[PDB]
Amino acid sequence: ELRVGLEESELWLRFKELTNEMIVTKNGRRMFPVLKVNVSGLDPNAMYSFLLDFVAADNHRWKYVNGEWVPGGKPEPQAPSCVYIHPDSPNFGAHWMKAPVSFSKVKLTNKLNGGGQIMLNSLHKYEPRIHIVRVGDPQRMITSHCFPETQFIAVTAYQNEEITALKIKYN
Ligand SMILES: CC(=O)Nc1ccc([C@@H](O)c2ccccc2F)cc1
């Protein structure tokens, strides 16, 4: 049975408790915490690619008001479908299962300017999603998982000072 487990879930939950925020910039910013998963139940002999995208969570944006996140207006039109291919792709099932798979190099941006970055809209909430795509498959089988503990609001600058301090504490 294929299982994709979130690593450092307790750490992600510390951020989610406060409402997590990830900075987006013109040139792109890596995430903290880094999305990392453990994988079991692939065919060790088969080859697969791992991909990452970000799903919009709401039909509205958010705003930080009097120290609380609240519905903050109408949403902007959806960000373009950006997909990040894990740089180890394609690789054997045995490779992906021998140690956690880490998406440490992905960068989030608010400006489409190449570099394999992910475009997000500031003040909107997103949920990371990991896809496993089997290589050489005429049926193009793909298996997707979402990670609820990793939801975050994209921001140009941190709003909650507790988030600013958590990012410094754990990173
Ligand atoms: C059966 C079927 O729809 N297969 C399929 C679909 C999409 C892809 C990727 O292009 C892909 C595109 C966007 C996001 C993640 C992805 F993995 C690969 C295989």
Swiss-Prot record:
Cystines in this chain: none
Ranges of the DNA-binding region feature: 11-171
Effect of H131R: In SAVA; reduced DNA binding activity; increased cell growth; altered expression of genes involved in ossification and notochord maintenance
Cell compartment(s), UniProt: Nucleus
Domain of life: Eukaryota
Tissue: Detected in testis, but not in other, normal tissues. Detected in lung tumors (at protein level).
Implicated disorder: Neural tube defects: Congenital malformations of the central nervous system and adjacent structures related to defective neural tube closure during the first trimester of pregnancy. Failure of neural tube closure can occur at any level of the embryonic axis. Common NTD forms include anencephaly, myelomeningocele and spina bifida, which result from the failure of fusion in the cranial and spinal region of the neural tube. NTDs have a multifactorial etiology encompassing both genetic and environmental components. Chordoma: Rare, clinically malignant tumors derived from notochordal remnants. They occur along the length of the spinal axis, predominantly in the sphenooccipital, vertebral and sacrococcygeal regions. They are characterized by slow growth, local destruction of bone, extension into adjacent soft tissues and rarely, distant metastatic spread.
Main function: Involved in the transcriptional regulation of genes required for mesoderm formation and differentiation. Binds to a palindromic T site 5'-TTCACACCTAGGTGTGAA-3' DNA sequence and activates gene transcription when bound to such a site.
Name recorded for this polypeptide: T-box transcription factor T
The organism of origin for this protein: Homo sapiens
Gene designation: TBXT
